[PDB]
Amino acid sequence: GTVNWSVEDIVKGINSNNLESQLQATQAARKLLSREKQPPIDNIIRAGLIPKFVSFLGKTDCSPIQFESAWALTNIASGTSEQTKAVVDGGAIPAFISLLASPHAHISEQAVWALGNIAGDGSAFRDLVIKHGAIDPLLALLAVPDLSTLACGYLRNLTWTLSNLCRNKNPAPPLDAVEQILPTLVRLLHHNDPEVLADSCWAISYLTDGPNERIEMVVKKGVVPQLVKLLGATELPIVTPALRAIGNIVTGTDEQTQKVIDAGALAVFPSLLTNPKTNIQKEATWTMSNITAGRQDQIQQVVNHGLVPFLVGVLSKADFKTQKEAAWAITNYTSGGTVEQIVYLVHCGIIEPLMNLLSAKDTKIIQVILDAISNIFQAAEKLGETEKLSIMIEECGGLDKIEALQRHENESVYKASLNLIEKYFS
């Protein structure tokens, strides 16, 4: 039938002015474009087939050709930006938006998917899809009393497409579009399907990746407790974006950070900071570093949840990128913490792993650590214990790392480092 047609034969069938011949040829094109390996997208574009496919989207009396052309165009739009542009340039956006109202679920679903690929290209096409009025009919498809009545594949495609409308920066999505989408997104974030939850979390992570005003729009919707819950999911594809969203939120105000703490996030961190997935440990440690950049009462919560030993652990042994986040977490802690909090940090064993990292060939982490040490010495001065600290550092071999850093190429490193030796070691 329609298996392995040449593009030439597809063109012949499409040019026939016989709707059924055109349907067979469009199906043949769909099969080429859906094959496992190397779909001939550029060949199909070069043959001038896009305008015909777009015209077929409007064939209400022939729902099969609407479906086949929708699938063909979805796959062309799944390619490079130039390939996606060819689909947009053919007038596909409003044609697909019209198909959202199709009585045929499999057709409206394909239109949802195609619009997701187009919006996924970047901010410009995202915003163009929004200008053509895609949001109202997309949200209308989810306006049911219980999401569980929808087919799960259908619901997953809608959630994914909505997440692409929330994605990308420079610019971020229109504020009014975000407000319009948020209530449905919150509902999806409470739906019990792992893929819907993952893509909902991804969407929330995009919406919180920005200025405090953007974070506030999300936090105000009361989603933090649900994010904290999903943070404890067993599925890594859910934990990953849930953690990114939580991490994003704590880059915000002290008050936004406090919502995360109030929701119980810190109790999940012993497991996150020891997670066998390197990326999870790194993101969790980055998150901790922004929490220890917070108020003294928020640092105290980190202490009370027993998280300081976990930071000592990550500093002692982790992927180097994670160790650098831990170094940051410590410098922030020592910068904002009380004397008592800083004393507690040393008692937990921070000094030796801090000193061991001074042999890293990374200027930034060296600067960060020297800052922490300086901060810890300033606390020692207030207790008159600079000598005890001076001894701890010498004993673990930290002093002849600091001494050697006096000859380092970077100005801050050699400078801070010189300062430390005269000041506490001379």
């Binding site: 474009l33 859906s34 094959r35 496992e36 779909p39 699938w71 979805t74 796959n75 739009a77 799944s78 390619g79 996606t84 394909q110 998917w113 997701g116 690929n117 996924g120 290209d121 994914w160 997440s163 692409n164 994605r167 993952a198 893509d199 991804w202 990746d209 990953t240 974006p241 991490g247 994003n248 704590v250 880059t251 915000g252 980055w286 570093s289 922004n290 950049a293 940051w328 922030n332 910068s335 904002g336």
Partner: peptide, 16 residues
């Protein structure tokens, strides 16, 4: 302040 800035596919092809 001292706060610091910092796998879903962007596009999907329908196969089979």
């Amino acid at each position: 302040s001292r706060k610091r800035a910092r796998e879903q596919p962007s596009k999907r092809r329908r196969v089979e």
